[PDB]
């Protein structure tokens, strides 16, 4: 149950901040779960998705057994595009259908200077919580 | 416009009363607001007693209320004289002072001198550095609490006498009548007239 008197609970005021979010809040909200090989190894539950991570889709019309890199991240439409999943138009020009990143499993990340530091900080914040369990 | 047997009423609503309406919707929220202002003040004066200074014993004025005893505003500046504490030092030790107060009874005087010496009795001051003028040892085995509540010495204590049981004696069961009141009331309203009739009788010569 929510106990803080400074955070909302209404449908109208959570739907307003979700569709009118700034684009740096909006990458925190387009997060994605990791695989079982990768959260046994980095011990972190989920990450915000970025440009070159490779993904298998877990729900929808396209499901499973196709690892593929993502290629474009519409934050305006809350939608990622993946290099393999596409759709033929009437014209004959195939274009990417877009899917939502909570319907998505990262199977290999993209590591730079900053993605290392974020995984390191999201991990250390868990074994502090394991030390409350005395 | 009226009807059969009812009241004849004068409702005072012939004025623009809907712009001046007061709704007590904040009255829960002002009760928890003025609780927090008591709590945040009680720890700001942290060792000092809550509800501030000691107040005097005061008898209420009227025929309706002069049987009862009430907390007052402050001590009359002659109690502080007789109890022996300075008037500009009284309010800094925790004694409410009212300089416009008269005591025209000795009985009401000495009850607040005794009230004030009993306060100074069970008071413990704190030094700045432990030099202690007119002050003794460590703070009364650390003063048994920190802060008192709703009065230093419980200001009402409106007490009544024992007067156990007497034997109905002679001339107590005989005289003091209703006629004692009716002769007293006519002696009040004819006192000024008769003393005029004494002056007329003495100028006969």
């Amino acid at each position: 149950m929510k106990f803080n008197p400074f955070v909302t609970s209404d449908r109208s005021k959570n739907r307003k901040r979700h569709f009118n979010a700034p684009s740096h809040i909006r990458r925190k909200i387009m997060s994605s779960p990791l695989s079982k090989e990768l959260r046994q190894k980095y011990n972190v539950r989920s990450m915000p998705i970025r440009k070159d991570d490779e993904v298998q889709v877990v729900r929808g019309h396209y499901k499973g057994q196709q690892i593929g890199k993502v290629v474009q991240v519409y934050r305006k439409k809350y939608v990622i595009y993946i290099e393999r999943v596409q759709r033929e138009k009437a014209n004959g020009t195939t274009v990417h259908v877009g899917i939502h990143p909570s319907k998505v499993v990262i199977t290999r990340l993209k590591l730079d200077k900053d993605r290392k530091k974020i995984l390191e900080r999201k991990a250390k914040s868990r074994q502090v919580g394991k030390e409350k369990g005395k | 416009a009226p009807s059969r047997n009812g009241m004849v009423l004068k409702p005072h609503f012939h004025k623009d009363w809907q712009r001046r309406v007061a709704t007590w919707f904040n009255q829960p929220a002002r009760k928890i607001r003025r609780r927090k202002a008591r709590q945040a003040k009680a720890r700001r004066i942290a060792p000092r007693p809550a509800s501030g200074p000691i107040r005097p014993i005061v008898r209420c004025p009227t025929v309706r209320y002069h049987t009862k005893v009430r907390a007052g505003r402050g001590f009359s500046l002659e109690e502080l004289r007789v109890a022996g504490i300075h008037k500009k030092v009284a309010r800094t030790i925790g004694i409410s002072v009212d300089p416009r107060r008269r005591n025209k009874s000795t009985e009401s005087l000495q009850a607040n001198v005794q009230r004030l010496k009993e306060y100074r009795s069970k008071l413990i001051l704190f030094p700045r550095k432990p030099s202690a003028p007119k002050k003794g040892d460590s703070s009364a085995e650390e003063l048994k609490l920190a802060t008192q509540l709703t009065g230093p010495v419980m200001p009402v204590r409106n007490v009544y006498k024992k007067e156990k049981a007497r034997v109905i004696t002679e001339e107590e069961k005989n005289f003091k009548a209703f006629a004692s009141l009716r002769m007293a009331r006519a002696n009040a309203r004819l006192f000024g007239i008769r003393a005029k009739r004494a002056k007329e009788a003495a100028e006969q010569d």
Partner: protein, 260 residues
């Protein structure tokens, strides 16, 4: 309604001109130029007798009826006919004023809370609340209450030592102090007989908080438990008693229908 809904110029046309005598907006140009303005008939007008915020919202009940209703609600939580006829499946449960020891008040982890209700055989009411995880019918969903739920057992204690932390995640369950009881929590819906789990130190304060009939209560200044209009209350015993049927005449069990 926010203010006047009369923030609009409108006077009647009054005279002939073959339209009804409702006030019309002034001017021209716009669509809102001769339309009928304020009155409880009109699109855009003012509602009949607009609600005022100084309607009397809050009601008084005097204290010896609030205490009457909360002595009447505990006594019905101790009858198995009444507490099962409200919905709580108390079929597998032991002795019906369920009290437990005072160790439960110092639980802090809700795994110690779930198996207590399984070992008291009171978990099956909680599993009935999980089946009543419906969503709201009607327009109450956009007024932010979308999920309806059943009330389950209530646990009444004293000296909170963590009992409020172990139970507040379990759905449909309620905690209340044995000092400060609530008729809104003991009789949900106005109906009597909610299933309650007690504690030793809670169950022993009721004799000093409401008193018996012989001594008045000590934690309430001038309260003694209310008197009883009936002593014997099962009239299948009273009317079958020898004193009554010695005095009764005879039953007249014929019919005597209409003779043609």
């Amino acid at each position: 309604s926010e203010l006047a809904g009369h923030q609009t110029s409108a006077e009647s046309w009054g005279t002939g001109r073959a339209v009804a005598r409702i006030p019309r907006v002034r001017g021209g140009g716009t669509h809102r130029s001769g339309q009928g303005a304020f009155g409880n008939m009109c699109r855009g007008g003012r509602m009949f007798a607009p609600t005022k915020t100084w309607r009397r919202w809050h009601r008084r009940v005097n204290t010896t009826q609030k205490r009457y209703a909360i002595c009447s609600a505990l006594a019905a939580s101790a009858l198995p006919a009444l507490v099962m006829s409200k919905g709580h499946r108390i079929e597998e449960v032991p002795e019906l004023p369920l009290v437990v020891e005072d160790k439960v008040e110092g639980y802090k982890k809700t795994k110690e809370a779930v198996l207590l209700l399984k070992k008291l055989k009171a978990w099956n009411d909680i599993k009935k609340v999980y089946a009543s995880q419906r969503m709201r019918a009607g327009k109450g969903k956009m007024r932010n209450r979308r999920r309806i739920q059943r009330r389950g057992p209530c646990i009444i204690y004293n000296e909170d030592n963590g009992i409020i932390k172990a139970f507040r995640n379990i759905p449909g369950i309620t905690l209340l102090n044995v000092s400060k009881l609530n008729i809104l929590k003991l009789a949900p819906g106005g109906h009597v007989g909610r299933f309650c789990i007690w504690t030793e130190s809670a169950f022993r304060k009721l004799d000093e908080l409401y008193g018996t009939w012989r001594k008045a209560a000590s934690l309430k200044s001038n309260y003694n438990l209310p008197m009883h209009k009936m002593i014997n209350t099962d009239l299948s015993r009273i009317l079958k008693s020898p004193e009554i049927q010695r005095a009764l005449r005879a039953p007249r069990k014929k019919i005597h229908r209409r003779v043609l």
